[model samples]
Target: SDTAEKAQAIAAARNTFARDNPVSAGHHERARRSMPGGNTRSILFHRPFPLVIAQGTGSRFQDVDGHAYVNFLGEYTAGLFGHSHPVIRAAVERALAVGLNLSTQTENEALFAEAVCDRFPSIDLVRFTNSGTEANLMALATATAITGRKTVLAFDGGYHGGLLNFASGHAPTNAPYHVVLGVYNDVEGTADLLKRHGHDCAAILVEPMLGAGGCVPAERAFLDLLRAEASRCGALLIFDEVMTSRLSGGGAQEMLGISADLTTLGKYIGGGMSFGAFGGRRDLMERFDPARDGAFAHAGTFNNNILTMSAGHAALTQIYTRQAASDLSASGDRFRANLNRIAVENQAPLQFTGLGSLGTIHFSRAPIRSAGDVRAADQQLKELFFFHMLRKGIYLAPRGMYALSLEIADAGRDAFAEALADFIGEQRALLM
Candidate 1:
């Protein structure tokens, strides 16, 4: 890739594409008005401004220039049903028509609750929040309050939203809390961390399967060890399934046959809207009750509003059926198998990581178990591979993240494989 042709082509196309789109250009210019760079999120920004999207109906998104692409971002992992699936659209319209916000409650709430509870049995009761951040933050706060302990232990590269408290408390090297940072997938390290700080720790917030930060899957042995230690220490274990829930029907717990005291879900749960939820055993969830000496408190006007609940109900109840979950899981497995075959055939030091619908590629022969391994992936090679894939008309996450969805059917799958094959064929340097 040092040859520079592919990168040049991708950059030129992106530049032309960005320039031709009036919506993206206009928005970029106008975004300087009130918001810094016209967005609140730090992650959405990219080189030469971002592709301002007009509308997305299914897996395909179109820029203002009329170019359509297979949408891999999936509304930051919330569009499992794809954008505005007819089912969800109808549900949202009907719910909005009835009432946008209700001070009391609606059947939508109970329906959505049942949908989630039916799948994730650990969530005997649930509470809704507007985003993953709110859900994870509230989950942690609840755990801390219930256990009357302020410290938490988490895996080294685990991401539980971008909560300021977690970020400040659990920095990569300079952890602030009475935090014991254990290596992901390491049973011994996890046990040692719990043994050292389990008594003072309120909980262990873990991603049963990691995403975004690094597509690493926490080994089952490590999880079991954490569970036993938490039980021994009276510390809570909160599973942050914000991204990993898409892996299977009931999130990673069902997929791995494990349980946590609390769980956080977002992204696909809203059916495409921005909604998130956190819940656990009924006893722990009742800590929010106003009648009791409530250990944890939460309230939000937009929480589980009519539109979100309705759309979420459609997603959980209709969109992702048991068969669909299995199919998506199969697709993930197929993708990994195909990519592994390609890597072996080409003699490239490449392997896939993560579980279910969420995964990533690490450019190393060694199995990646931690963020350190992810960081060890050759950045230049990874960037080149991404650009090569882009040049072949398959769009991936600019940040090297990959995900599968219901809308990505055989045609999409074939196209992705073809794109990678083309890249492998062209890149002669790696072949030898």
Candidate 2:
């Protein structure tokens, strides 16, 4: 597909993109001091510089430089219904017209919360927070307070929202018993650890699907073991569905057929706004009720801001169609197939891994089951692939985390696969 004609067209498009979006590039240039590396979030960083998006419509986005991209990044998979989703846009607009935030409560908050509770039966009761980070923090805090324990058991190669309590404290000066780390997919090893001291554990948090940890899917058996172990040790089983929640009616829980005592949700569910939530069994959730026992303090200014809720609810509504679901699932299938085809055609020592609507490339065929396994894989090639994709106008997460949205069709996926093949074919050596 990279005939001279195609190359010329793409090159001209890149120039137009750069020309149209100068302010975005200029902003990045100036942001280096106030923000680290010209952008706020480190994950947004790409090779050379990142494209500043001017606006998005449907599955396409126009960069500040006037380049149009199919938007495979999907705002880090935080967008469930693609850009400027009409329903979401209208709802947020109406809500903003009334008021953005309210000093008290609005029907919108309860409406969205009920919608979530109805979607996943496991989340009998829930609380809303401003972002995934805050939701995870509340989940851990509630777990500790309810169980009268301090340690949190987390999976290796799994990322929970970053907070001091969730930090791995295995170092010399940190709390010796605060954070307990275990290997993913090692059901036996994890079970053994729980058997040893699961009683002291407050909660065992897991990302059923690792997003940034290189696209590993924890085995069903291992998930069952974690659930069992947490029960035996009287600790809560917490599943962070921030990235994986896009997959089905109930996200990974429905797909896995396993329920957790507590589940944390963020990313897509907020409807592309900065939002997050954590909830589980009604009884477990009542522990956070200030109405009883005066337990678990809670306060946030815009926890359920009217505008955010309206936008999120609108976004969620758009994604409820079976057509959207099937389309996205099919897109993922197409991507995985293309990735494997490219890997085999190029013999680049790469393989693809992901389930349902998500996909990622692993440099090793051993199946990434733990953090150590992921580390041992050829990380350099994986990184090289990212920069190459960027140059080809295909944006992917810096750490190899990628998911296909309903907006991504065959053309987008094929372009990504073809770009990889070209990158491999053109490389003089595996490393420059």
Candidate 3:
């Protein structure tokens, strides 16, 4: 079993892909003059080049190469309603007639806030931000201000935002918040670290489900342990539900029956617009009340833009209803099970890990509890599978992660299954 066999396979696939996608390659080549490495998103970049998406409607989008694909990436979990849901369009269209920039407070903000607070049980009072990264930063700042502590505790491999990524230790571009990195899901290790550093800990920020890391979910027991430890340390627990909020109507905190002192939300909450929020306990959040003396200011120019507010309200109320949440979650579970079954039946060393409508394929059968657990998994297998799905008109993350939108119906799930089966059938020789 020469390891170089997989390399050759990948090379052959890349050559075919490059030959088939000349238009996409041209787009990438042209983009390199303006953008770094011909792309803004790092994960989207591949060896041969990346496909340039043209337009999207419903569950599918067409590439510049004239290839139509089921968008399994779901815009990195932001496009929860899929590419052009009627509800979002209607809301935005209505907002357009009314006008765009309004410096003064509008009625949409309060209504949207009420809806958000109602859905997320932990959020009694809420404040808006521009992105999930901003929400997390605001949460940390709030926690630090309240506790008079300078340090925040976050898990390794956690991705809060571009400026707050912790994958493979601390990144240089990350925010300058005195951070203490704790191992995700390592109960004993995290607890020991917290005990030693809890004195200066302002907040414990963690994603209920690791998004950019590997899509492995947080164990209920592990979440409870973090909650208990945060309370014992007199630090706020900031649940970063930027990607997992769609797991349930009240989000993971409500579904898991574990509440955080602070919660950050982003992605689909904005109804396909740029949106983020940091919210929680009434007592804690009231610190930002402008009427109060010496109140902390949380400012953003477009925090309450009418388009996002209106669309978010409509999305939460009309499109992404409580029933829709539960239904999609159930569908996702079944889809993952099907994918795992296909791999098992084909005797391929691949496993799909995650909860609800989010998952990532790992070329390993080992039990995965954290991103670190899948570090040694074969990357070539994932890359080949990505191209295989592309040929089948299924578009997903280059990293093998899949985020199902509301548009992913039965047919979409089947498409992925078929493509995966085809890939495994061809690569079965090396997988074993």
Candidate 1: pairs in clash: 78-267
Mind giving the per-residue lDDT tens digits that candidate 2 earns over 182-292?
Answer: 777887788888877787999988888777776678888989888888887899989988877777767788878899999988887877777889999988888777878
Name the candidate, 1 or 3, with the larger TM-score value. 3
Error of 3 at 189 (Å): 0.6
Best by lDDT: 3
lDDT against true structure, model 3: 0.89
By TM-score, rank the candidates, best first: 3, 1, 2
RMSD of 1: 3.2
Q: For each candidate in the order shown, give its overall lDDT on alpha carbons.
A: 0.76, 0.74, 0.89
Tens-digit per-residue lDDT, 127-214, candidate 1: 9999888898888788777888978888767777755223223655442445666777888767777777888989888888768766
Q: What is the lDDT of candidate 2?
A: 0.74
Candidate 1: what lDDT?
Answer: 0.76
Superposed Cα deviation of residue 179, candidate 1 (Å): 3.9
How many clashes does each candidate structure show, in the order listed?
1, 7, 0
